[PDB]
Amino acid sequence: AIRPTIGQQMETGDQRFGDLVFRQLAPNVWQHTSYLDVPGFGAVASNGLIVRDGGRVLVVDTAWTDDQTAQILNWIKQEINLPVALAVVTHAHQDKMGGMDALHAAGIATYANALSNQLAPQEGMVAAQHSLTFAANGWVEPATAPNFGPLKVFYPGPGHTSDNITVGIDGTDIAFGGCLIKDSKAKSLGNLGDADTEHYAASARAFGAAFPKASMIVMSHSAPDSRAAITHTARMADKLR
Numbered sequence: 035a036i037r038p039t040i041g042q043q044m045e046t047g048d049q050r051f052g053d054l055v056f057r058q059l060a061p062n063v064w065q066h067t068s069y070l071d072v073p074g075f076g077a078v079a080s081n082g083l084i085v086r087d088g089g090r091v092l093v094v095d096t097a098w099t100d101d102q103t104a105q106i107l108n109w110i111k112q113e114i115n116l117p118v119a120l121a122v123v124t125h126a127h128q129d130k131m132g133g134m135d136a137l138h139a140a141g142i143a144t145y146a147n148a149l150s151n152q153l154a155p156q157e158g159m160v161a162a163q164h165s166l167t168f169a170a171n172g173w174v175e176p177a178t179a180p181n182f183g184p185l186k187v188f189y190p191g192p193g194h195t196s197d198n199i200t201v202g203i204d205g206t207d208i209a210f211g212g213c214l215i216k217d218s219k220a221k222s223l224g225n226l227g228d229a230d231t232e233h234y235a236a237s238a239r240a241f242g243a244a245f246p247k248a249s250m251i252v253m254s255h256s257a258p259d260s261r262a263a264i265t266h267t268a269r270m271a272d273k274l275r
């Protein structure tokens with residue numbers, strides 16, 4: 035088993051595949067988990083999603099690296115055997131966009147916040163091939179997110195980064211907060227180096243209001259949690275201002 039220094043541990047319901055871990059969350063949704071080995075510190079887990087939508091699959095976030103992201107595509111090929119139509123990546127940091135080149139080599143259409151694509155070169159990332167844009171209330175402009183099936187993309191405002199986006203899975207009670215949301219038992223909001231400490235609390239709450247009936251909150255570095263992940267994150271963020 036993989037025992038990361040940071041990130042959730044393995045429990046019943048987890049499938050080890052190569053260097054990665056997969057967990058079924060719903061009949062059509064799986065969480066992918068990949069691990070960055072930090073020398074002298076140990077492994078840091080990062081989570082994303084895989085969603086089946088009829089005869090195709092949709093991905094949220096890459097793994098940390100190209101090779102790990104290729105392993106995600108191999109797991110999808112083995113376990114689902116349907117083509118990946120597109121991937122949405124949730125901001126320009128390594129845990130979310132480190133594996134773009136693997137997606138592109140596979141011919142998968144990639145989407146990110148226009149701002150994430152603009153920041154990518156400055157963050158040592160490769161931009162997605164398509165840019166999402168957002169309304170004044172945070173909802174994605176639908177013309178920029180064609181054929182997204184159940185993925186409902188919401189920009190909650192600046193928080194963990196200025197470009198962080200979130201994704202609800204329509205037809206389920208699952209919503210994905212990425213690195214913006216930490217779990218209900220977290221001590222810290224994680225890396226605040228690129229964070230907006232003034233607006234973080236409002237952005238966390240806006241995510242909760244965007245998906246008000248999501249009962250399972252998925253996030254980058256903990257196991258899926260209740261809505262208390264959202265409220266606890268917001269309460270921690272209240273202390274930043």
Ligand SMILES: CC1(C)S[C@H]([C@H](NC(=O)[C@H](N)c2ccccc2)C(=O)O)N[C@H]1C(=O)O
Nearest residue numbers: 070072078127128129213223224225254255
């Ligand atoms: C788990 C993290 C504390 S690190 C990760 C991200 N950092 C990276 O992807 C870095 N490339 C990195 C550097 C050193 C060690 C691990 C990751 C960030 O800055 O938000 N997301 C952070 C977070 O979600 O709070």
